[PDB]
Design an enzyme around this catalytic site. Structure first.
Site, mmCIF file in Angstrom:
data_model
loop_
_atom_site.group_PDB
_atom_site.id
_atom_site.type_symbol
_atom_site.label_atom_id
_atom_site.label_comp_id
_atom_site.label_asym_id
_atom_site.label_seq_id
_atom_site.Cartn_x
_atom_site.Cartn_y
_atom_site.Cartn_z
ATOM 1 N N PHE A 80 -1.867 -14.570 27.603
ATOM 2 C CA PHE A 80 -0.723 -13.702 27.313
ATOM 3 C C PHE A 80 0.003 -13.178 28.597
ATOM 4 C CE2 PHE A 80 2.275 -11.367 25.278
ATOM 5 C CZ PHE A 80 1.997 -11.318 23.759
ATOM 6 N N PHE A 81 -1.224 -12.635 29.326
ATOM 7 C CA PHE A 81 -0.769 -11.835 30.548
ATOM 8 C C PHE A 81 0.070 -13.085 31.504
ATOM 9 C CE2 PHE A 81 -1.878 -7.563 30.712
ATOM 10 C CZ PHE A 81 -3.094 -7.408 29.893
ATOM 11 N N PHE A 183 5.069 -6.494 22.857
ATOM 12 C CA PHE A 183 3.673 -6.156 23.145
ATOM 13 C C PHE A 183 2.803 -6.873 21.898
ATOM 14 C CE2 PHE A 183 -0.047 -3.465 23.135
ATOM 15 C CZ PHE A 183 -0.108 -3.204 24.550
ATOM 16 N N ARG A 323 -3.549 -5.113 38.158
ATOM 17 C CA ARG A 323 -1.881 -5.352 37.742
ATOM 18 C C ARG A 323 -0.883 -4.450 38.035
ATOM 19 N NH1 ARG A 323 0.236 -9.637 34.542
ATOM 20 N NH2 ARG A 323 2.130 -8.916 33.448
HETATM 21 N N1 NRD Z 1 -1.767 -6.234 26.270
HETATM 22 C C1 NRD Z 1 -0.942 -6.618 27.225
HETATM 23 C C2 NRD Z 1 0.088 -7.626 26.953
HETATM 24 C C3 NRD Z 1 0.694 -8.252 28.230
HETATM 25 C C4 NRD Z 1 2.306 -7.859 28.439
HETATM 26 C C5 NRD Z 1 2.366 -7.231 29.877
HETATM 27 C C6 NRD Z 1 2.773 -5.825 30.067
HETATM 28 O O1 NRD Z 1 2.078 -4.936 29.209
HETATM 29 P P1 NRD Z 1 4.474 -6.032 29.450
HETATM 30 O O2 NRD Z 1 5.421 -7.074 30.105
HETATM 31 O O3 NRD Z 1 4.514 -5.995 27.942
HETATM 32 O O4 NRD Z 1 5.202 -4.467 29.666
HETATM 33 P P2 NRD Z 1 2.855 -5.369 31.792
HETATM 34 O O5 NRD Z 1 3.367 -3.909 31.983
HETATM 35 O O6 NRD Z 1 1.748 -5.490 32.345
HETATM 36 O O7 NRD Z 1 3.724 -6.286 32.521
HETATM 37 MG MG MG Z 2 5.723 -7.660 31.943
#
Ligand code: NRD
Ligand code: MG
Ligand code: MG
Ligand code: MG
Length: 340
Positions: A80-81, A183, A323
């Site tokens: 998913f990441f 999310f 990250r």
């Molecule tokens: N539980 C993590 C879901 C992955 C989505 C990635 C993020 O949360 P989002 O793109 O949803 O804000 P990030 O801030 O790390 O980019």
């Molecule tokens: Mg993101």
């Protein structure tokens, strides 16, 4: 220690961190899976995967899960990441066609993951491998619900593609609705169930106390991510963040928007504490003297306990994971773990 602007004393005092005993093996097995499925370049896997803390995040959440269930969840979560990164890179490079085809394949592979286990698109094949495994733990009725929920997540990601390519920042309320999908609130909620070994009947999981506790656990996680990921997201021209909606549509300064997000996050905690009592009272009432009642009662109790664990796991993840460490990057708009 956590910086004062991100620190939540109630989490630190009242939500003690937990860690699943499988985590050491989980860490390496998911790293090797990312390597073998070619989901990230081999050198980026070796330099960054452990520091990204994706397995720590899931091992602090789904306590009590069978090792193989947690492994499928962690692989899916790491996927998913990577998908979030691919979506970002497709937007930044204007690859509207590549994204549309990926979106179509994920919809098809979600409904029939076995058919896509060896797809030429490695991101699709990796998706299908984790999803096929998740579909092997509970009856097909749960699989169909997971699929319903994730079809919606894919389409939320498509809406985000549309917003970013057009320069549209959603309104605050529009954003809050979209954020339950981007999310994947309901996917993490669905995954509580194979982790405790029981598909919950609709009447149980739709009980107001269960549903509200499940919602607040995810609202906290998504909005706390917004708070901590704001610097990387401003730097990367991301438009989806509660703070960005507040700055854009209500004329708040950055300092004001950060305070407003932190207050909303704080309220999720104390709202959850109130509904947790109701959800645990519901768990007790399910224990009606029957074997099935004891099973459902224990499952609800374990799931609510993990809804609570999500608060602490997400909290510490954001201060441990590479990250979010935008200050260390040569190019603040291009994180080093992303394939550009
Ligand atoms: N539980 C993590 C879901 C992955 C989505 C990635 C993020 O949360 P989002 O793109 O949803 O804000 P990030 O801030 O790390 O980019
Ligand atoms: Mg993101
Ligand atoms: Mg995203
Ligand atoms: Mg974010």
């Amino acid at each position: 220690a956590v910086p004062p602007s991100l620190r939540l004393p109630v989490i630190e005092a009242a939500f003690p961190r937990q860690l699943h005993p499988y985590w050491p093996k989980l860490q390496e097995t998911t790293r090797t899976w990312l390597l073998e499925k070619r989901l990230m370049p081999a050198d980026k896997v070796e330099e960054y995967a452990d520091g990204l803390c994706y397995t720590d995040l899931m091992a602090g959440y789904y306590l009590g899960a069978p090792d193989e269930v947690l492994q499928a969840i962690a692989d899916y979560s790491a996927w998913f990441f990577v998908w979030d990164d691919r979506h970002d890179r497709d937007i930044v490079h204007g690859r509207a066609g590549a994204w549309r085809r990926l979106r179509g394949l994920l919809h098809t592979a979600l409904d029939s993951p076995g058919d896509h286990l060896h797809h030429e698109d490695t991101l699709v094949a990796g998706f299908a491998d984790s999803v096929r495994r998740l579909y092997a733990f509970l009856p097909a009725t749960w699989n169909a619900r997971f699929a319903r929920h994730f079809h919606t997540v894919i389409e939320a990601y498509d809406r985000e593609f549309h917003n970013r390519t057009r320069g549209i920042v959603p309104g605050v309320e529009e954003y809050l609705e979209l954020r339950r999908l981007t999310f994947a609130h309901w996917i993490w909620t669905d995954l509580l169930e194979p982790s405790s070994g029981c598909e919950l009947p609709d009447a149980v999981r739709k009980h107001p106390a269960y549903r509200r506790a499940a919602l607040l656990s995810q609202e906290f996680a998504a909005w706390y991510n917004d708070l901590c990921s704001l610097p990387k997201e401003i730097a990367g021209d991301e438009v989806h963040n509660l703070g960005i909606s507040l700055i854009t549509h209500h004329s708040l300064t950055l300092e004001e928007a950060i305070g407003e997000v932190r207050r909303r996050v704080e309220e999720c905690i104390t709202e959850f504490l109130a509904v947790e009592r109701d959800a645990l009272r519901f768990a007790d009432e399910l224990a009606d003297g029957t074997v099935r009642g004891k099973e459902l009662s224990g499952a609800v109790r374990a799931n609510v306990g993990n809804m609570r664990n999500w608060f602490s796991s997400v909290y510490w993840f954001h201060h441990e994971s590479g990250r979010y460490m935008v200050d260390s990057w040569d190019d603040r708009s291009t994180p080093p773990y992303v394939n550009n």
